[PDB]
Design a protein around this ligand. Sequence first.
Ligand SMILES: CC(=O)N[C@H]1[C@H]([C@H](O)[C@H](O)CO)O[C@@](O)(C(=O)O)C[C@@H]1O
Ligand SMILES: *[C@@H]1O[C@H](CO)[C@@H](O)[C@H](O)[C@H]1NC(C)=O
Ligand SMILES: *[C@@H]1O[C@H](CO)[C@@H](O)[C@H](O)[C@H]1NC(C)=O
Lengths: 319, 172
Amino acid sequence: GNPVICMGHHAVANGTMVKTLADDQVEVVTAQELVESQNLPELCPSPLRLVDGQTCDIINGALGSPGCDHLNGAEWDVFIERPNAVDTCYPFDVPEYQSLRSILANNGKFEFIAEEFQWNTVKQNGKSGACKRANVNDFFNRLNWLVKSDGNAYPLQNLTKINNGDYARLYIWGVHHPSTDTEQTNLYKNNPGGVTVSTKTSQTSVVPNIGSRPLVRGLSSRVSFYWTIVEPGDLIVFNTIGNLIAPRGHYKLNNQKKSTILNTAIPIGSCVSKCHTDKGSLSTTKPFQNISRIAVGDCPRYVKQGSLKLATGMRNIPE
Amino acid sequence: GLFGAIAGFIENGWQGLIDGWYGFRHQNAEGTGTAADLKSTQAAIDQINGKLNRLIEKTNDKYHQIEKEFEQVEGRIQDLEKYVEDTKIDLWSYNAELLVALENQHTIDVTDSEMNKLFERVRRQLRENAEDKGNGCFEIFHKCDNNCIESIRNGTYDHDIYRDEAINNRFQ
Ligand SMILES: CC(=O)N[C@H]1[C@H]([C@H](O)[C@H](O)CO)O[C@@](O)(C(=O)O)C[C@@H]1O
Ligand SMILES: *[C@@H]1O[C@H](CO)[C@@H](O)[C@H](O)[C@H]1NC(C)=O
Ligand SMILES: *[C@@H]1O[C@H](CO)[C@@H](O)[C@H](O)[C@H]1NC(C)=O
């Protein structure tokens, strides 16, 4: 009476250390890494629609700066904005810059609808030499520079467009800021000037500012840009005894806004991936990633740890 | 683990068992063998792959969020934005840390448990014909050729065939 039957389990020569509640160094037979710490050196253009702003940041794209014509009609899931974007036009500032940038990015498209504003005795299509679109003085192709009559007459101008459409419109407009009182009335009637854009809900009013502003631009003055949203059943009124960088129309707003913007210098490639960081796309099934807190799409969750190993086997006790 | 089989009364694992997680190793008059147990192996694998599937495919489908990198400081609004993201990152970091720790503690317990269930299964088949040696091995108190060993492994072993021989040997 001496046969023997033994019950046992497998083992390998060298397993993987994992953590538990009690022990931070337990060797198990197999394990799976749950933190993705590798990224592709490029951005995948599928299956998410990426639009490469190239030389235009998204604000200049919407204004219609020279070199931003490729962005016309563009629709995007993610607008890819380059860190070395270049100002190519008449120097400006946007009072609520980040908020306008957010609205354009989230809206997801550049669908401009032209309409014409019967301006009075005043000239239109004023251009400049700091905004030289190919070989010639030009301006923001979405904006229209008004300047004195041939008889030094700029009458109070009140025009109105009515939104009977089935969507909300985005009007982007500007206000000119001259350096001198002579520059002030050399291209415009008064001092001071002023613009007042009203809806039936709101009123926005600006009076220009006149003074020694710093120079590169080659110039001394600026434009300050504003926007107004006109809901279906609302109106927009432009009044101006001077200085209005008037609009050439309105951008279409999607009712549902589900797009966004990513700022990075990473080249767009040929791979497939629904997850993009500013360091490049991720191609992974892992639940977590330590690559960047800036992540867009269908992504792992960003965590601080560089590695979290999940045990997929029993404890490893070799020999 | 909770049951004390793996890294317990089983002193170590078997490198030579390469087609199963658990198995049998015997010795009788005509030799020795090592064979895998499929049911136990399969039970452990199913439970671990289960954890994996529940994990892999979260859903974190996010598009327009907030700014997270800044050139210069602006004060109040920027501080809130930074504080919000920093709070999120710590809470998710904590979640991942706890999750893996819980899952691994449980995985180790499950595998230790499946080992023990195998051992207990074989103990019950043997009834009064064998004695626990204490290292995961049974001393069988009757002649047990290869068909007999196999009958133990595939669960068809009938203890009544050998009980007379076995009771004799154990107690006399
Ligand atoms: C008259 C006009 O509307 N445009 C002219 C501007 C404006 O007078 C200034 O930009 C206002 O400060 O000046 C230019 O030298 C320029 O910038 O290229 C020439 C241009 O034709
Ligand atoms: C101009 O203003 C008057 C009174 O303020 C208003 O009744 C009229 O509709 C306006 N016209 C346009 C074209 O905006
Ligand atoms: C992510 O973790 C890896 C190790 O897995 C490490 O080399 C890398 O530096 C980490 N990245 C960051 C941004 O901390």
